[PDB]
Amino acid sequence: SRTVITEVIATADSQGRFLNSTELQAAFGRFERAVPAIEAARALTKNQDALVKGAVQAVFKKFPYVTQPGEKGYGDSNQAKCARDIGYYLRFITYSLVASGTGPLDDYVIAGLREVNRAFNLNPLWYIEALNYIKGETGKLLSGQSKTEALLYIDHAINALS
């Protein structure tokens, strides 16, 4: 994926030159910001089930008509797939916080999502609402640095969706 240390290694490879104080400063700051990000990962991991259920029911609240028969939302298998997708997204957001970057999230959801969207008619706005609910929910689950960085990760994901 694209972690700060990974991209530093890659760019150092590019110009055919060793590392310098600037990129080591970047890695430094990454190391210190990891700890609040690590606590964010803990808080998100311990809350994952409630996060997923709340996001699913928030999406249902915003668009109950989707649950009507003959639509994508209707069907227990459909709802299970909604929950599984939101869980995958949350896990990749945890990986983003751990990795101190968008690397794993970018590569594993953002790469080639709109293709499936168009093919399977999976409206991004649904996952956008789910992530907005996760934002509101982590606003109380997290505070300080961890809340801000998790918020920026998830709103990066939202902006990628839209």
Partner 1 sequence: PSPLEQTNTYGQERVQANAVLETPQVTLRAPFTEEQFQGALYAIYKQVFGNTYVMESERPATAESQLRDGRITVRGFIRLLAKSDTYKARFFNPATQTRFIELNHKLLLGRAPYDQAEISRHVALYTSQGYEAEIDSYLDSEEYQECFGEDTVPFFRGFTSQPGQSTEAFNRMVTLYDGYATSDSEWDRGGQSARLTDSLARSTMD
Partner 2 sequence: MNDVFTRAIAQADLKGSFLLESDLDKLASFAKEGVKRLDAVAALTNNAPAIISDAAHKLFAEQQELIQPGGNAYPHRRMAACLRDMEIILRYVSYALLAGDASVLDDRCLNGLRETYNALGTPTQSVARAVQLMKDAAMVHLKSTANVTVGDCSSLYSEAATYFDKAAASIA
Ligand X SMILES: CCC1=C(C)/C(=C/C2=NC(=C\c3[nH]c(/C=C4\NC(=O)[C@H](C)[C@H]4CC)c(C)c3CCC(=O)O)/C(CCC(=O)O)=C2C)NC1=O
Query: Which residues of this protein are in contact with ligand X, per CB under 6 A?
Result: 21, 24-25, 28, 33, 59, 66, 72-73, 78, 81-82, 85, 88, 108-109, 116, 120, 122, 126-127, 130, 144-145, 148-149, 152
Contact present, 37 and 153 (Cβ < 8 Å) = no
d(C-alpha 73, C-alpha 65), whole Å: 8
The phi and psi torsions of 122 (rounded to 5 degrees) equal: -90, 100
Q: How far is the CB of 121 from its own copies (least distance, A)?
A: 8
> 126: exposed, middle or buried (C-beta count within 10 Å: 0-12, 13-18, 19+)?
buried
d(C-alpha 42, C-alpha 21), whole Å: 31
Q: Does 162 bind partner 1 (CB under 8 A)?
A: no
Q: The tokens 């640095």 sit on which residue?
A: 145
Q: Does 15 bind partner 2 (CB under 8 A)?
A: no
Q: Which two tokens stand for residue 44?
A: 């998100």
Binding site for partner 2 (CB under 8 A): 1, 3, 5-6, 8-10, 12-13, 16-21, 24, 27-28, 30-32, 34-35, 38, 41-42, 45, 48, 88, 91, 94-95, 98-100, 103-104, 107-113, 115-116, 119-121, 139, 147-148, 151-152, 155, 159, 162
Binding site for partner 1 (CB under 8 A): 1-2, 10, 13-17, 102-103, 106-108, 110-115, 160
